[PDB]
Amino acid sequence: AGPTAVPLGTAGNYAILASYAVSTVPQSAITGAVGISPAAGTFLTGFSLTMSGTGTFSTSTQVTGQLTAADYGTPTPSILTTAIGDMGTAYTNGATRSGPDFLEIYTGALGGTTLLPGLYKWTSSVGASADFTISGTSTDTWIFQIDGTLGLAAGKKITLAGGAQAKNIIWVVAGAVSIEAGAQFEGVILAKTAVTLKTGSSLNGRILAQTSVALQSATVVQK
Ligand SMILES: [Mg+2]
């Protein structure tokens, strides 16, 4: 049940992929790669980077995986060029799906809901002032098309019931994304603009943002 997957291509090789900037207030806890392009590595801030012997990638105690930037040694820039392209294709693939299963459901106020599989369209912002559940099997899919902002209020949680998998939940979001302090998010974010995870928030999925990403001592576990 639910729509055909959004293929991330090589954007699925990153925990975080951004074009303008990635900032962390330590101590963030990122499982997977961090890439920035076309911006340079000086727009990776707060990571206390060490450049590794080849000059092609850097390391941080905040990241289990490699950081890469567009100014790094060959062939890193070509790799990120492809990843940024594949994120653009993924966003458009998700945003342009037609025939939604749910249209303006709950007016985009998702507190206390249980969301079954399908294609969701909101011509609005989406927020949640309370915990909500995504409920489906390990093979079901969700695509959440959001014309405005996406938020999850402080300390609130998305629960996966039934076997539902974060990698099968795509948030395709035109406006800014704000996960508030201590909130627990589930799914891949394909953001057209900025994504911010505030103090002690966590995301099981990926952050694939066409502008900036801001982390405040936040957890990103790639799914
Ligand atoms: Mg609500």
TrEMBL record:
Which family does the record assign?
Answer: Belongs to the ice-binding protein family.
Official protein name in the record: Antifreeze protein
Q: Which domain of life is it from?
A: Eukaryota
Keywords of the record, alphabetical order, are:
Signal
Per UniProt, what is one Pfam family of this protein?
Ice_binding
Q: Which organism is it from?
A: Typhula ishikariensis (Gray snow mold fungus)
